[PDB]
Design a protein around this ligand. Sequence first.
Ligand SMILES: *[C@@H]1O[C@H](CO)[C@@H](O)[C@H](O)[C@H]1NC(C)=O
Ligand SMILES: *[C@@H]1O[C@H](CO)[C@@H](O)[C@H](O)[C@H]1NC(C)=O
Ligand SMILES: [Mn+2]
Ligand SMILES: [Mn+2]
Lengths: 446, 450
Amino acid sequence: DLAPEPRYAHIPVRIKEQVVGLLAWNNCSCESSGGGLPLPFQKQVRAIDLTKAFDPAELRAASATREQEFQAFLSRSQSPADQLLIAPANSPLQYPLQGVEVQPLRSILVPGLSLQSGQEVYQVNLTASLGTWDVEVTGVTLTGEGQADLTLVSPGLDQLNRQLQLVTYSSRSYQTNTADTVRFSTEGHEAAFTIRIRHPPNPRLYPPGQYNISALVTIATKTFLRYDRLRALITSIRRFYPTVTVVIADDSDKPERVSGPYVEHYLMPFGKGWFAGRNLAVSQVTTKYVLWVDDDFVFTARTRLERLVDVLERTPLDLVGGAVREISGFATTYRQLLSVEPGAPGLGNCLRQRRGFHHELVGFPGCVVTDGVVNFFLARTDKVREVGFDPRLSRVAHLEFFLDGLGSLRVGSCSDVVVDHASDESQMAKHRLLFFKHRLQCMTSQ
Amino acid sequence: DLAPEPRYAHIPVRIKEQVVGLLAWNNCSCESSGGGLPLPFQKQVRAIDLTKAFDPAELRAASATREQEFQAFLSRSQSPADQLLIAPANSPLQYPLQGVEVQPLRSILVPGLSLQAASGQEVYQVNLTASLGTWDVAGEVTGVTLTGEGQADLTLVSPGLDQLNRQLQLVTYSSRSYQTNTADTVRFSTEGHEAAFTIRIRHPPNPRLYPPGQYNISALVTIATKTFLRYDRLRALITSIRRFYPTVTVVIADDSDKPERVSGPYVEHYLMPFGKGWFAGRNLAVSQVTTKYVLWVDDDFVFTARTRLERLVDVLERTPLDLVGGAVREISGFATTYRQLLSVEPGAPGLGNCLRQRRGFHHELVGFPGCVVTDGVVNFFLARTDKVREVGFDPRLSRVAHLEFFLDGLGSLRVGSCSDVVVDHASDESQMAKHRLLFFKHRLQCMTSQ
Ligand SMILES: *[C@@H]1O[C@H](CO)[C@@H](O)[C@H](O)[C@H]1NC(C)=O
Ligand SMILES: *[C@@H]1O[C@H](CO)[C@@H](O)[C@H](O)[C@H]1NC(C)=O
Ligand SMILES: [Mn+2]
Ligand SMILES: [Mn+2]
């Protein structure tokens, strides 16, 4: 809402064309570049309308049920902590604004409560909805200790405030991760604030036993009827890393035996699929880090994994891609930007894919921060599992992983770690899937 | 310190023995019940000291490593949004206190900004400061002077208070550098008054919606299991499932040395390297599930008329639960739901924390007789596939594990247990290893079982 309020209706405003254009107007669409012969400094943008992957009758149904499932999702994600709260001006209430948190069914002293010399009597009310208040300061009368509503009354202002330094909140009902919006009040004044109720996060620390690559890194791949390429890969890896474990997910119809020291071969139902096999491979990794390589890759003296290890050891990144070099001699890092822009409510949003990166990774020449990369990368195993390779993407997929991970996964890309590359209804289905899964109406590729 | 500050040193205080005992004193330990013959109303508590799984050397080492990796983890988790901020009393500054959020490298109008100063003054001025973004004011209110549009520091100056406040209604924040999930603590200020507040900078969460296809069980549910050289039990299981659910997919992870053929309609059989193990096989099975929900069953189970999956589906369809366990009935006729409570208590800094396991539940699940909320359950359960994958079956747990899953999920996974959905049950160095693993993984020194 931009429209001027009554109180300020008279006050004149000239719109800043430039800045108002920065706001999300929930009206995005996806348009193709003008067609024909291209121009040198222009990139051709091409649009995909995912709504056209449905029968117009089915489209309505899909949009409805997608909206319904989304409303359900909201209700199980969102917290009173996410409410817009406005701090009142000119209140004598001093209260914690953020960063007050308790474990479920635990207790804490509440910081920073006070009432800001000598009056009649001073009284403050505390109200909670998922917990109970407790504290005795000489001179101060308490009403409601061990209840959701607590009154503190004291002729001593210093006293009242000293007792406030000793006010405790206790979570009274068990929930996993929520919050309780408390009310702190005095005569003619009201303040809302939120205590977060949650468990501390699982830190998932790795035992240890430069860098021990065998201890830190598992190599994961997926193959299908390409045993020649796969064996060349394993041979090449062994030329530089003799004891690193290689996990191989395999959905071949008549699987050959693959074995050797530190190789683990997993057989899947014939044509179970690509991402399913990737999900399989990662689920078997016990090391801090996993390296994804395609079955058609070859290690060279340029595949210096230590450098990728270094990056993840020394930076907050979760995933760091290398570069893949074609036999044509060109090496790509496939640095991609993925952003979702708000579209019409219930049509869905618009995905924008474009080549590029966000910024250089300070301290690490040749490395940048981006949204997606080529399928040669080292990553924290847990973060990869957290995002997952959606087993439904069975045939042709790549960026969809980075899209599933978008914002959750800290992505980087280093050009100096290099691996060599050895020389439909599915499309429609994926369009329907991505429409539903990610609430998209369309996408542009660039 | 409990100690009073100088300002308040003169004030007398009574220690509530009862209340002080509620606080975390970072000093837990784990002690066994007395030995000998038990008494009827008493439950035997048994302690495990995890630290005894290491030599004094290794203990020292591991504590160090663990503390270092923990500090690392903290630094990549924690945010300015976690800082304690205290709202000033008697300030003319009105500002958003929580719930203001922007996507990285995007922009928003900042809600609720205003200066509630008294009218009559010669000039009104407000300062805005950011650290990861820049201010702009969209439409310009006539009478207001702006300094710093498109910079991290912005000044609004106006003779008219009305004008200033109208201008504040139009202030925008833009994120200027890309990060995935962080926050920026802004400063809003006027003469002799200061207000801090935090804008969260993050992407909206992946909603991961499932097409729906009362309830189509084949669409909503995949059944997952893991077997090892027990094809008799497994075939009985599949036969029993098919007696009630002809087209539900059964995913079977298998680490047998010489695997038999399992196949039949809607069966997916996955072969693992010999003896890769228990949780690894569970992790494998779940990684292959495409449905909104997964049902875990052991290879030694049997479906009966009592295995009415629809009821478990109903629970997850109608409640915020992520996982809902059933009951497993022994051939002795007793059915267990194995409702467990798991809690960690803060221990001495760098010895680690104490895990308390005890039989029990938190409360009844309102609206669903026979169902409770708890921390862990027996290995018969329906769950949201994504949440199960989010927690994972640690592939390191190769032999003997159960509650370890619920512990890995503790806090993250919303657990329920219904007594009325029932399945039948057909008639060391590794211990030390697991103890060392649990020590690091969960920063624990000891545990008690009850
Ligand atoms: C590295 O890990 C391997 C295999 O996991 C182990 O056998 C070896 O002792 C480790 N090496 C070092 C230098 O710690
Ligand atoms: C349930 O879903 C399955 C799996 O795709 C489908 O083949 C079957 O037709 C569905 N049953 C009904 C009646 O919805
Ligand atoms: Mn290829
Ligand atoms: Mn058994």
